[PDB]
Design a protein around this ligand. Structure first.
Ligand SMILES: Cc1cc2nc3c(=O)[nH]c(=O)nc-3n(C[C@H](O)[C@H](O)[C@H](O)COP(=O)(O)O)c2cc1C
Ligand SMILES: Cc1cc2nc3c(=O)[nH]c(=O)nc-3n(C[C@H](O)[C@H](O)[C@H](O)COP(=O)(O)O)c2cc1C
Lengths: 122, 122
C-alpha cells in the first residue's frame, strides 16, 4: 500500500521518527530515510542498535507510528511532503528480515514494521 | 538549555516530529526544521495549520516529545545527529508567542513547547 511518492521520499535523506506507547506517555526514537529497507508484503525494516525502551514498549503494544518526509519531493500544495505510517512492529534477530539490515555492524536486531496504512500528510 | 548543536541542526532543513498521548495510543505529527521559532525561556514555537487531534491530546496531557536532526551536523561517532526534546505544550491564538509565527498566514494558532530537557541522541 506504500505509494510511489513514499519511495521518492526514500531517495532523499531525512530523519525518520518512530512512536510507541510507553508506560507513562508516548516514546519517540529515530532512524534515517536512507536506512529503511522496504520488503514485499508492506514491510519496512529498520536497523536496531539501541531502541531498548522502544522494544520493551512494542512487547506490550505492537502498534507504532512512523513519520518521514523530504523537502525535495513535491507535496499537494507546494514543495516538500511526508507520510504518517501506522503498522505493527516486531523485532527480529535472525532470518531474512534481520539479514536485510545486517550490513550495519552495530545492529543487534531488525525492527520490522508491517504497514496497515500510509497517509501523505502534505 | 538547548545546546549549540541543536541550533546548528536548525540551519538545515528537515522533518520535525511531535508525539502526543492519544486516547488509544500515541499520535505523531510533523513540521519543518525551518519552521521552528526558538524564543527565550526555552520555548520552541510551531506554526499550526491543522494539528486538531494533537491539540485535543495536549488538552488532556500537555507533555509532548519532539525529535529533529540533520545528516549535515556531526554526531558523536559519525556524520549526522539529532535530538529528543521533552516539554510541555500550549496552543496560542494571540500574544507574542503567536506573533512569533504569524508570518505564516495559514497558521490558525501557535504550538508553544516549553522545553524541560534536550538530549542529543547520536
Ligand atoms: C537522526 C538519528 C538517527 C538515528 N538512527 C538510529 C538507528 O538507525 N538505529 C537505532 O537503534 N537508533 C538510532 N537512533 C537513536 C534512537 O533515536 C534512540 O535514541 C536510541 O536507539 C535509544 O532508543 P530507546 O530510547 O528506545 O531505548 C538515531 C537518532 C537520531 C537523532
Ligand atoms: C514534512 C511535513 C511538515 C508539516 N508541517 C506542518 C506544520 O508546520 N503545521 C501543521 O499544522 N501541520 C504540518 N504538517 C501536517 C501535520 O503533520 C498533521 O498531519 C496535521 O497538522 C494534522 O494534525 P492532527 O493529526 O494532529 O489533526 C506537516 C506534515 C509533513 C509531512
Amino acid at each position: 500500500m506504500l505509494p510511489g511518492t513514499f519511495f521518492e521520499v526514500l531517495k532523499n535523506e531525512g530523519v525518520v521518527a518512530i512512536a510507541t506507547q510507553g508506560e507513562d506517555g508516548p516514546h519517540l526514537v529515530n532512524t534515517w530515510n536512507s536506512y529503511l529497507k522496504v520488503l514485499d508484503g508492506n514491510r519496512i525494516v529498520v536497523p536496531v542498535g539501541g531502541m531498548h525502551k522502544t522494544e520493551a514498549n512494542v512487547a506490550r503494544d505492537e502498534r507504532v507510528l512512523m513519520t518521514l518526509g523530504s523537502r525535495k519531493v513535491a507535496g499537494r500544495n507546494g514543495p516538500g511532503t511526508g507520510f504518517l505510517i501506522r503498522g505493527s512492529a516486531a523485532f527480529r534477530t535472525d532470518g531474512p528480515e534481520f539479514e536485510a539490515i545486517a550490513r550495519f555492524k552495530w545492529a543487534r536486531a531488525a525492527l520490522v514494521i508491517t504497514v496497515v496504512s500510509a497517509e501523505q500528510t502534505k
